[PDB]
Structure formats: C-alpha cells, structure tokens
Design a protein around this nucleic acid. Structure first.
Lengths: 82, 45, 123, 205, 80, 155, 129
RNA sequence: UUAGCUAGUAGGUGGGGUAACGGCUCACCUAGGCGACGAUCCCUAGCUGGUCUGAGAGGAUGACCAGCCACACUGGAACU
RNA sequence: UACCCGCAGAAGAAGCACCGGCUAACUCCGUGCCAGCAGCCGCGGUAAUACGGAGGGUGCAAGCGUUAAUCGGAAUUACUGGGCGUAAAGCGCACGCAGGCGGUUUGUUAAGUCAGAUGUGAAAUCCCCGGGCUCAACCUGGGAACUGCAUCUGAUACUGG
C-alpha cells in the first residue's frame, strides 16, 4: 500500500529525514511518489527543524494512505505550535 | 650478464667471431673543432 | 569537407594504439625471467645495457630493461614490470621494478632511493 | 602543514621584507637582505616569465602562511565569486583569522598570531575558534579570553602595533583586548608592491 | 481533437492493407543541415480503396496485426 | 618614459669559403603602456649590438590603437604568413591570458585584459606581425559612428 | 548555375567596394530590395534605385569615408547548403555591437537589434561590419 | 574485405487461446514483407539520471548514490 | 560519545622528488663512450652544472614520486574550426538514375521556421542565494537549470507544398 514515512539522509550520526509518500514495498531511500516535507532531529532550535505539507498529506490520507508512527507524531506536534 | 652476440652459433674460435660483432666496432669521436664539429645547440645554451 | 559529404560519411576520430600492450591496461604485471643479458645500443651511444626476456601472466613474452648499477636477476626470478620506454636500445618498452619481489633494490644509493627501492639509511 | 624553517632565507629569495620577524630589531642588522640565500646568491639570473609569476605567488603564500593545496582552493573560490579575481583573492587572505589577529596587533608576527589561534586564546563572537583559516565576516568581534589577557606576549605585541601603520577596516579597542572586523578591505587598503595579475596568469596556464 | 499524420501510399498489394511513407524534415544533430528522413507504416484500409501513389491520412488505433496499429482516416489526393 | 620588451634572439648563419659567419637577430617591441606599439628586428654580429638596432627600429615604426579601459573594443582576428591569431576582449581581472610573443606585444600596448589564442605557426616574428595586424584594423565605436553617419545607442 | 542570388548581391557589393566603384547594378528581386533597404537605413550604402518593368535592375550606390570603404566586411550566413535559423535569445551580435546581422522574421527583414526589441527570431541572412 | 534476407514469413477469413490487443496458435486463402534512410550476418556491450575532460561545440565513461532491465551451479519446465 | 574543564613538560610528531633545456633550483670530488642517465632533444671518449657521491638550492609537504588509464594541449578528422598547382590530397574523360541544390511574379497552404500558453522532462548531481556542523570537506532550505518532446493558439519574411 501507499504510506507516508521518513527516509533517512544526512551524514553519519547526524541524520536528516525527508518525508515521502511511497509505496510500502520500495526500499526506505528508494522510489517515492511525492516528497511532502522534512524533519531535522539535530536542529539548532533557533532555525526551522521541521516542515510538513499538511495540505498534501491530508490529500494522500484522503485517497487512502497510511502514516508511520513518527509522521503521525510530527503531525500532532506541528498542529500544536503552529 | 652474458653478452647476447649477433653471431649465430660460434663453431670455431670465439674471439675472432666477437671481433666481428657490433660489440667491438671502431669508435670514432666527434671533433670539437674542424671537420665534423658544428653544433646547433651546444651542451647548455 | 562539404556538409552534405559529412552527413553521408562523418569524421573518423583516428583511434590510437598503446605503447605498452603487454600490460593490457594493468599498471604493472608479474612475470618470470626466461633469460638475462647485455646488449649494445643504437648509434651514437656506446654501452652494454642489461635486459631480461620475461613471460607474463597473460602469456606475452617481452623484453624488459633493468635499471641501476649492478643486480642479481637470473632464470626464474619472479619480477614486477612497468611501462617505460628506452631509446638507446631497440624494442624495449617496459622497465623492471626494482625493490619489488625478487629484484632487491640497488646497493648504496642515497639520492633518488624511491625509484630503486632502497630503505632510508639509519643515521 | 607549516613552514618550520629559517625565516630569512625566505626574505632573501624574494628580495623583500615579508614581516616574518617582528621589529624589536630592524631587518638589515640580522641577515644579508640584498644577497640571495645559500652559496650561489651573489650571481644574478635572467629570471624567466614563468619564474616571475612563480616568484610572486610564493611571496604572497609566504606572507600569509598558506600552502599550495590550500592556496589553489582559495584561487578556485576567488574565481567562482563575482568581482576582479585578484582583488577577491586578497580579500580571502585578509579574511583569515591568524592574519586578522596580527593586523589588530595581538600577534607580533603571523606565526605568533597563529599560535594564539591554535592554542584557544581567541574567541570570535563569544565562541572559541581555534583554527587559523577561519574566515571572519563583517561585524564580527574578535577578542582574547581570560587566561590570555595575562600573557606578556600580547601586551608587548600591542606596543609594536602602535609603530606599524593603522588598518582602516578594523576598529581595535586595545585596553579590553578586542576589536571589530568592520568591512572587507579594498585593494587600496593593502600593500601595492604585491602584483596579483601574476598569480592569476599563473593558474590559468 | 485527434493526433493524425498524413503521408503517401508506397504499396497496396496486401488485402485490406497498405504501406504509407511519412516524410519529415529533421535538423541533423551535429552538422545543422535539414534532412528528409522517412517513416514507413503498415496501415489498415477497409474496402481496398486507396491506390498506389495516393496521398492519405492515418491515425493510431489498437493493434490489428503483427505490424499494423494505424488505420486510414480519409484520402486527400489520388489517381495521379 | 616607455616600456620595451625583448622577445626573441636567434643565431643565424651564412656560409663562405672560410666556413660560417654567425650573426644574431633580436626582436623587440616598445610601447607607451597606453595604445601605441612598435616592433623592431635588428641584426648584428654581436648580441647587444642587435638588440640596440631593434630598439631603434621599433621607436620609429610605431602605431596607434584605440583601447577601451585597458582592453579591446571587440573580438579581432589577425594573420601574417603561417600565424593566425584570435583575440577577444575580457572582463576586468582576467589578466593577459595569451601565448609567447603575443603576451609581450599586449603588455606594452597597455592591454590589461584579453583572451588570446595563436593558431597556425607560432614563429615569434610572424606572430607579432599578426598581432599588430589585428590591433590596428580594430575599430572604435566613435570611428563607426563617423563611417555610417550616426551616433546612436550603439554608442 | 546561379543558385544563391543574395550571396551574388553581397559579393557584388564587396567586389565593387574593393575596386572603388561609385555604384553597382544587378538583377532585382523583392528580397534584394528588402535587404538593400536595411543596409541603407543602417548607413552602409548611400542609396538604391530600381528601374525597369520587365527586367528590373537594382542599382546600389556604395559609400566611402577617408578614401576607404564603409563595408569593412560582409558574410553570407544562411546558405542553400546550410540554412541557419535562430531563436530570439540566440541571435548573434556582430563585432560585439558594432556591425549588424540581417534577419528575415515574420515581420519582414530587419536588423538583429530590431528583432530583439520586437521579440522575434528567424533566418539569419548575413553579417556586416 | 558482411548485399540480398524472410514461407507463421506479410496480410486476409474463420476457429482456438490470453487478464488484455495481436500469427499469440491453427486450418483454409492471397503472394506478400524487409532493405543502400544499411536489411541479413559477424564483433563488442547491461540502459539511464549521471561522472571525468573541455572556453565552448565536442570527446571519454556508466565505480559509489538513485530509476529501469536481466540472471541466481548449467540447460529445460511448470506448479502454488 | 560529541563538547567542556584540569595536570605535566618543547616535551611524544618530516619526508619525497627535483636542480642541461622545455622547467622553479649549482658547485666540488670520483668516473673516463666504462659504469650509468634518459619523457623528447640528447649526456658520458680525464677539467661532466646531464652518470655516482657530497655540500648547497627549488618544489610539494603527512605525504612525495614512478607506472597505467581518459580528456586536454592537437585548428593533428577542423559542426563551431583544416585542406587538395609543387608539401598528403582533383577520379584518365564523359553520360547519367537515386540524392543534394534551384531564376522571377501574384495568390493560397502553414510542413520547416518564429512567438506565446499548458503538460511533462523522478529525486540526488551541477550552478545561484541562504542555513547547520568551531572552519573546511560533509549535510541541508529555497530557487535557477534540465538547451528536450508533445499538445493548443497566433505570425507568414525566408525555405517547402
């Protein structure tokens, strides 16, 4: 099925996660359908560090896609503060 | 390390055979003056 | 040189042969000394120059210069050989590598030791 | 990664003062500045066109402390930028920390100022920077930290900065031991004995 | 609103079927000269109607044999 | 006042009953660092005698060229015998990127910024002819205003 | 035989300009007159006339300055062998300003400059210097 | 210094087959189809995004990362 | 674990290639067309700045050299951008099918051509402006670019019909 998940990138011990509407069979860093936002867990906290696209995630959940554990938490947390 | 001579198989007398190899052969010298002595360049300039 | 002529038959990039084809684009190869011998050079030079015939791991049997002053190669010494032309001396397109496998390096160098495989003298 | 040798062999090969000993003692007492270094110096050469381009690059390198692999990288950057590639290249050497230290006059030489920098005596904007090639920006403060106000080196060095010329592009405030890199220096602000066109010609062969 | 090529009719020995050269003027990639490059096509003609030499017009439908995926919309010029 | 390079010094020769009479050619350019350039080519039996005959032959025999801010007006070609020679104006801080004999001529002409390239032969004497051939036929925006009888925003 | 008559006009200029002729004639056509006009508006030639009904004859009058030609040089670019079209960003400029291309656009023959203002490209006929 | 290749071959009608169009398969019928815009045959090769070089146009290349293909001791075949 | 603080003492940490020209850097001693060097020219036959050693110097520097391989330089396959009287190069001469090219004028068409719009040209890479690792490599946000292909609407000077 179609999912919404984090692909890892970044250097070693300093990850960085793109957020990617994939088919679930494809490998983590491989073939995605869309990119939708990002997530930096090492961020400075004076300067962004997470940005989802809530308008295009809600579209893909419409058409009937899953979400991860993490991408769920990131949606909960980017609707509290913003 | 053994000279590889241009004579084939030596058959009798080897000194007289090597005498007629390029191994030996007159060495003449370039004159530095007169009558075959022109350089373009010269060793440094 | 007419445009129309080049459409129908375009320009041939003339493709270049290598000077070291026994290597086959390996940067060295290994082989075995068949035979080791001095020979006289081309004109105008005068000398005796040390070269071995050598059968490579890819079949090719080729002759090979030996650098430096003095050596101990012979029948069946296993040696490493590299590209490198020698002029005063016809048909010799490869050098032996000194100080690699069964050529030990040169006795009593001080200058340019790395080209002859000679360890820094302890002082 | 650093020239460890005799500093006046370098100054004789250029035929120039490269500022590599401070000026407690002046230059012409110590060495022989007119005569070139080693055995065959008093004989002139006809120095070739490659020669004079090389000789000029190595003057600049040997002032600022920089080695070739690193200098070549400054040159790539300096060309990448928009501007005269000579003027840009000298901006990027007057940006360097170890130099900016010395031009504010906490070091006596660039080799001293580099030992400050490496030994964690320098902050930039509060943070301890300890690497010589750090590129200072406009409106950064550089300043000494609190062990290293109590050194004899730094006080005696600030005496020697009053006898040299003043840089325009720094505001130093020398009782505190800080100062503000205000703007990038222009070509007019720097020494005009350095030809820069020779370096650029060199690399674009 | 259908994509529709034109051409002309370089055989018609086959039964309900013709062969139709499409010309086009391509710039050569290197030398800059514009060139006649031809594109032959087997085409479905119902009614055996189209003669040899005839200008014609054709469209891409589903596959109809091994070769044909092209069917004949209308004739334009003919009998010449 | 004016700047004066020595490009090249051949030894040439002439045969006689005796054997060879050797002799030296030198080749010099002079210029006012500001759009004037001569070249001269001396011969003599000693070398410093020959450079001197060239420096004289260069001062007289010396031509004007309209530069623009220390570079060319527009991209010029030039040719003499085997030597073809293309030069192109450049943005400030290129320097004179350019060959052997070319590089001399442009420096004392007071070009500061060019992209040259010598095709063909690179015989020093025929290249400084081809380079000067280039620079002298090259033509300003004020000259072509006059030619056609305009003075437009092409200016 | 006679297979590019624009190149013929351009050569007839060039060769007259070399031989110090006041004027040159050729067979007319529409397109020759179009070009002849651009060449005149830009000031390389003094004036052209056309005479004849049945076999018309274009007579250009050539132009000199310091006892020396105005038309320094004049290439054909698009030939019959090799037609050369260009989009509006890709238009050449000739001596980095100072000469002129001549372009056939859908709004007639004009200079390179006047096709950049009008925002067109097309077949490039000829450079002039 | 490979010029003629092709008889399920090229098209038709009808049966069968496939998730699906189809000589995919079969029987009958027509005698076509491809080719100097290089068919056929031989040699070499996984393809691309890219990479290196070059002022550029070009040339060389396809290791890592990513997309597609193919293979799983060699050959053949199905089953679920 | 990054990162931060304390202790001791200049302590524990410099080599490789080159110096005849091209090419930055020169002098002694040995050797005597021998030994050897050499990328190309070439050096060496008793005063070797070219061999071997020493002293000095130049260049790179935790690397420095040799070899192999690609592009460059090479306008030496030349589209950009070469030639063919004697340097390599005009078939021994013609006729002529495919092919390429085609005088002048009006109309029409709109294939080439040009302009505009939409769709696509995966992400990474490259380039620009930023941000984060003390700096840098490295990572990353936004853009530009992907010169292409298709569809639609115009233009009609040139080419074609």
């Amino acid at each position: 099925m179609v999912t919404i998940r984090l692909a890892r990138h970044g250097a070693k011990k300093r990850p960085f996660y793109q957020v990617v509407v994939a088919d679930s069979r494809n490998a983590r860093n491989g073939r995605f359908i869309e990119r939708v936002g990002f997530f930096n867990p090492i961020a400075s906290e004076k300067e962004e560090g997470t940005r989802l696209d809530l308008d295009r995630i809600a579209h893909w959940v419409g058409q009937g896609a899953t979400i991860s554990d993490r991408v769920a938490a990131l949606i909960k947390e980017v609707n509290k503060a913003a | 390390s053994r000279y590889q001579h241009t004579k084939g198989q030596i058959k009798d007398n080897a000194i007289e055979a090597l005498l007629h190899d390029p191994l030996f052969r007159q060495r003449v010298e370039k004159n530095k003056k007169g009558k075959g002595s022109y350089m373009r360049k010269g060793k440094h300039g | 040189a007419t445009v129309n002529q080049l459409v129908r038959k375009p320009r041939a990039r003339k493709v270049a042969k290598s000077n070291v084809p026994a290597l086959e684009a390996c940067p060295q190869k290994r082989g075995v000394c068949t035979r080791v011998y001095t020979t006289t050079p081309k004109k105008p030079n005068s000398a005796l120059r040390k070269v071995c015939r050598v059968r490579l791991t890819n079949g090719f049997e080729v002759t090979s210069y030996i650098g430096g002053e003095g050596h101990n190669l012979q029948e069946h010494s296993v040696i490493l050989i590299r590209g490198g032309r020698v002029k005063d001396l016809p048909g010799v397109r490869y050098h032996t590598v000194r100080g690699a496998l069964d050529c030990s390096g040169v006795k009593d160098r001080k200058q340019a030791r790395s080209k002859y495989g000679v360890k820094r003298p302890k002082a | 990664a650093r020239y460890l040798g005799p500093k006046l062999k370098l100054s004789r090969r250029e035929g120039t003062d490269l500022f590599l000993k401070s000026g407690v003692r002046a230059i012409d007492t110590k060495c022989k500045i007119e005569q070139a270094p080693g055995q065959h110096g008093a004989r002139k050469p006809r120095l070739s066109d490659y020669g004079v381009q090389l000789r000029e690059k190595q003057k600049v390198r040997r002032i600022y402390g920089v080695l070739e692999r690193q200098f070549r990288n400054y040159y790539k950057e300096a060309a990448r930028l928009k501007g005269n590639t000579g003027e840009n290249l000298l901006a990027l050497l007057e940006g360097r920390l170890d130099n900016v230290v010395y031009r504010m006059g906490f070091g006596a030489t660039r080799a001293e100022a580099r030992q400050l920098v490496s030994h964690k005596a320098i902050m930039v904007n509060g943070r301890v920077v300890n690497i010589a090639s750090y590129q200072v920006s406009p409106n950064d403060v550089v300043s000494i930290r609190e062990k290293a106000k109590k050194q004899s080196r730094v006080k005696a060095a600030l005496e020697l900065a009053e006898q040299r010329e003043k840089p325009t592009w720094l505001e130093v405030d020398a009782g505190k031991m800080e100062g503000t890199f205000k703007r990038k220096p222009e070509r007019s602000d720097l020494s005009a004995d350095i030809n820069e066109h020779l370096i650029v010609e060199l690399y674009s062969k | 609103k259908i994509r529709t090529l034109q051409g002309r009719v370089v055989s018609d020995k086959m039964e309900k079927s013709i062969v139709v050269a499409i010309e086009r003027f391509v710039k050569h990639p290197i030398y800059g000269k514009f060139i006649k490059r031809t594109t032959k096509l087997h085409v479905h003609d119902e009614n055996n109607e189209c003669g040899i030499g005839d200008v014609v017009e054709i469209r891409e439908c589903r596959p109809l044999s091994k070769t044909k995926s092209w069917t004949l919309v209308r004739v334009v010029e003919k009998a010449v | 006042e004016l700047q004066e390079k020595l490009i090249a010094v051949n030894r040439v020769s002439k045969t006689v009953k005796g054997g060879r009479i050797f002799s030296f050619t030198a080749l010099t350019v002079v210029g006012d660092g500001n759009g004037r350039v001569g070249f001269g080519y001396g011969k003599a039996r000693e070398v410093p005698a020959a450079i001197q005959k060239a420096m004289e032959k260069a001062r007289r025999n010396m031509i004007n060229v309209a530069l623009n801010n220390g570079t060319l007006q527009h991209p010029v070609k030039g040719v003499h015998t085997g030597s073809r020679v293309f030069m192109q104006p450049a943005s400030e801080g290129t320097g004179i990127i350019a060959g052997g004999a070319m590089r001399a001529v442009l420096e004392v002409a007071g070009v500061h910024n060019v992209l040259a390239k010598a095709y063909g032969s690179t015989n020093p004497i025929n290249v400084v002819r081809a380079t000067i051939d280039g620079l002298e036929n090259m033509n300003s925006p004020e000259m072509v205003a006059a030619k056609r009888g305009k003075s437009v925003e092409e200016i | 035989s006679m297979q590019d008559p624009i190149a013929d006009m351009l050569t007839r200029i060039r060769n007259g300009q070399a031989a110090n002729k006041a004027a040159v004639t050729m067979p007319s056509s529409k397109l020759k007159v179009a070009i002849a006009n651009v060449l005149k508006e830009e000031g390389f030639i003094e004036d052209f006339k056309v005479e004849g009904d049945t076999k018309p004859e274009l007579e250009l009058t050539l132009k000199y300055f310091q006892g020396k030609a105005v038309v320094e040089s004049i290439q054909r670019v698009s030939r019959p062998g090799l037609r050369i079209y260009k989009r509006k960003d890709e238009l050449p400029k000739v001596m980095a300003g100072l000469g002129i291309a001549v372009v056939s656009t859908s709004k007639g023959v004009m200079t390179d400059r006047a096709a950049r203002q009008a925002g067109l490209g097309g077949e490039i006929i000829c450079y002039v210097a």
